[PDB]
């Protein structure tokens, strides 16, 4: 598998697994990483739905950023100021759940730019994007006012862009070359959207959740990748959660797109390639969702997990996995050198301070030889 | 290693690692499993600061729910309603994001019950844990409208136990034979706490983050089980973050507990098992760490990291590994799911509803074969 | 998923993981654990053939011992004692390899019985197991010999058992109403077999490796478990090997049993389940294979890996992954107390005794503490 | 961690974990892989004795290829004719239990060239390497004779260099700039050796398995990386093994190298950098033998894990993890085509081709579609 190597001393080129931060992405290529592929329901196995798109430009988004998702992300090798463009196809917290872990995480590991965060409208302020993002602020209050007595406080904000959830196909984004287009879902209530970016020939579905409707299938023609929702069975739900026929039967009709209706969504599309995703990735579930699927669609397709990466290229549509450190660390990028507001007040008081406890001793032999 | 095999059909007794779900617990023991040891920055190999503890008498709690927990707490085969008492040390993001996880995930998962929240106030009204919440349920406000439609919205609510960070050594917690007591940390700014669980002639400190302080050596004194923080060394600052050596020195002198401090502290204490945690447990940092606490403290030791296990008995701690499925899913318990007493709006226009595709054709084979 | 909870204090009851050594063995049930499905290339994801079969009167079986699969059985907490019957199918590395791991590793362990290897003859005697076996203890002579000098030599010795591969469906194991038959394969060059074990009315067929062959489908009907290896697709050979066209649709017409004649096969057999291995389960791989079985087989189907587990009950056969330490340990049982042969010859000489260090005063400290 | 990114579309340099096949290895440079660390028994955290070795010449070995450590090899991906020269230090299990999947599986891989194969002699003929790997082929008899039906032959061989055990720090190579060097070991009987490689003014000392001895901290002294066995504690050996404290004691003084010993011996060799290894590497189990080193050891040190790695500089000797593939892969290099000119019978008989199963039909569908 891979490249053929030519030297004892050089790389193993067109490697068979994509270890991040391995590759030089090309001025006319996109990578596609998965970083949670599952459900509101938490696994080791499956973050909670997110994905990294890299462009050939330099450019990076984030597509939702689900809870558990940021561990994957954090893997990547990315430094923090090049995430800092996140869109939420909708507000369930399997959708933005980790947002506040790259917001406090992405500060802690030298992020020197605000977030910049697209999301949806609701059909009233308060089931939309600003009010959910003004409203997180709030609640991570203590840890945003204690950072910014230490770290300079540009960072910690969110710069929040909403767009209408009601529009058909119309642009939410647009800089340097770069489309972001937004159509609606059937899902939970109003607000939830898909997205298709668009970027030098390229269009990339993103369709996050939704039961079967007459706007993907349309604006989705001719994606270089299709993501979409793809359910467990029916079967699988009376196996898994002791379901009735009855319900089991209506959550693959109402509620979620079934395997089924996935494959013929496809057909319809036409992609190069599609991807199956929000399903429990397991040795039990997975043969009979690709089965449904391969009713109705025979293309290229991907049945997602955490960590599956496309690389989009004129020639090809290439699935691998990401091989990543579990042990990982944030690296370093450029920044600008940005100093503490030394005018913001302490969120101390005095009665704490005295608390502190005399260590002098049991420090003194350590403290010695590191000064020197 | 483990209890010796007396039947080639029967189980290994005593086994060497823990599986959660596999064990009964002992009318006199405690279980503590770590469900994160880390940092605010992300990573596979260890979520963000969580405990869940379970005693004797059936009462169980999360002390700390970090981001990326929840994927570990979902491991341990627990039902949903076993798990509705959650405690926070502190509001930061590493302590208390994944509570929207249990929140919507447990939901899902089948909780009955509302959420009970412990957490401390802060200096003013927008630095403590009722406030906190009160905006979380706001942020999450289109998540809860659209599941609460149709259901009971009892298991949506939270009710926050909000008590004053500066008490010493106070009650915030008596119920059924269980005391908890708070006393207050040095950490980022006012408002932060430490735990003592009481019951049953057992004291288990949970230290959450602190500066080495006054507090912890007199009220923690002789517990069964001590968690406390514990840095990585100024070396590995200088080696992991490229810091100037001057501020290396002060984190471990000045915002942190040194694995110095740690030792200075535990030697104080006394306990039965001090646990060391908040550090990357990597095969190059872990060793400078244990040195460091071995400096000033002899006694019992955990280098904790996730999925670690204590079992607390008259005659014993004990420390295991915890082998847990990476595909897990939820558990049922004893089902008390209540019906609405109420109508509420539908989130839904018909402008989306409209919006529903004909996929009749594309389910006829799989609706048919699973209706017969 | 799994069975209800009762009991806050009690057991996850029909667990939906497996956990080895957690689950006691009815007397009318079978488990049968894939301890090793891949290939004779390396990989951590798959250890070569290897199956372990437990049965309710208490006997234990290794079908198969593939290079890799030692660090999958010993992760079952198994006593050794209980796992001394060995059954080969054929002489390949990828089925046989960990046979040495399993000798040596046990003999340290306590095993205190020799190992009982049953496998087959080839077309010349140089071509058999008692051959291959004979050759493998003389190929271990240093460690045979240094070992005996220090342990019992009883557990040192392997008994071999090599029966006619010509023979259709033979007995070649009888004892305490467990019955195995061999029938012939067709594979590489003349000597591998397949087996069916019989006992307390089920049959468990390990199809071993075989191009399509007339005798498994007469011989395995109606199994309650029908192992058969299932190759890879032509496409995925000429993605993953870069054969040319010819050579890839050779392999799975010529060499290999092909998806689709797994089908066939499957379908004459008419098993309660069948379960398709030794093909890599990738991603990329895994669901054309599937596809490949469900043109001609309709029926229950796992498609193995590693640590996949079937319990066979007389309602079900149900298919679970287990759950197990990557950190395993030896599980002691019951083992007699045997000196060594004080008669037997130290195997140093004095040459090499001549040049102990002396490292008294660096061991006086710990053995001074431990002698208390 | 890491080096600074300086490009969105550029690599991650220096980078914090080592992908293997990602780097290229500098002129005066080392790299050193642990592919097994562990003990005789099997786990699949850790693999028997292996390590590879990478000059910066192009030339590499393997030292040691005990059971289970293939997996890890082959995840390197590394070419088969680039890892054609194997030493080992002794013919325990642990030791060389994996040779035969090396030459199995690098054969299918697309070795064209024989291993080769540098062993000690033992006291007798038969306690020695070239006994040994002679009866290895010959256990393996009918894998090579089916394997080499209708191909070149010449990969299959191996040629042993048997080296006298008894020599002091004598050369056993020199080729091309490398010389290793064998002096005698202590354990179990005549037979183990250790290697010192030297090339362009590097030193690595592989010490393989031994109590105590005068010739190490001589032989070894200074080297840039000095690998020594570092036994479990006599405690652990009761806790984990259920000795008698009388035995558990003798095994950290007669059998064994304790930690303590370890501590002494690295302290004459005074190395830039030592590796101990061979003990079980567990949360409760490293830490009490990292201490047993440091009483009489304060230099840098590795505890080694499976794939670990060190960088071997003028300027340093850095350790990292390796992160690669478990779904493995063989990589092709520049091959042969290589063309036999002796010819081979068939190992096949009429009786067992005459049981071919047509399987045209189940074939057609797939096989039509294919050929165009
Ligand atoms: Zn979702
Ligand atoms: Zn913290
Ligand atoms: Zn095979
Ligand atoms: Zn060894």
Redesign the interface.
Known sequence: ??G?????????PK???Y?????????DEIRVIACGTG???????Q?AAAWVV?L?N???FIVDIG??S??????L???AN?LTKIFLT?????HW??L??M???GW??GRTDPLEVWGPS??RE???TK???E??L??????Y???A??INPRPGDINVHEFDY?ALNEVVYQENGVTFRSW?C?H????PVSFALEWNGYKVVFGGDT???????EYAKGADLAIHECWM???QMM????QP?QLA?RI??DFHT?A??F???MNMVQPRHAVAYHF?N???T??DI???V???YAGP???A?DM?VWNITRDAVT?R?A????????????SEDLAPDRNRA????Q???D???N?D???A???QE??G
């Not at 459900?39 to 196995?45: F, I, L, S, V, Y």
């Not at 196996?239 to 002791?242: D, F, L, R, S, V």
């Not at 302490?346 to 008081?349: H, L, P, V």
């Open positions: 598998a891979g053929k190597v030519t030297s004892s001393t050089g790389i193993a490697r068979y697994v270890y991040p931060g391995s590759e030089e992405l090309g001025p459900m509101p329901t938490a696994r080791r196995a973050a890299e050939g330099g450019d990076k809870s558990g940021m561990a994957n992300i954090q893997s090798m990315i430094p090049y909708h507000l369930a917290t399997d759940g980790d506040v872990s917001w406090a995480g802690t590991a609701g059909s308060d089931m939309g009010y959910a993002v409203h997180m709030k609640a991570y209050n203590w840890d006012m204690t950072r007595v230490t009601r609606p059937i939970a209530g109003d607000g039961a079967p409707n007459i706007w993907y299938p069975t029916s079967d196996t898994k959660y002791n026929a039967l693959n009709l079934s089924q209706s494959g013929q969504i429990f397991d040795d039990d997975r043969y690709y089965t449904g391969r009713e109705n397709l991907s049945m997990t599956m699935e996995m091989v990543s450190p579990d042990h990982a660390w944030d690296v370093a990028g450029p302490s969120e101390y008081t009665y704490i301070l608390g502190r406890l260590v001793e049991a420090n032999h350590w403290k590191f000064m």
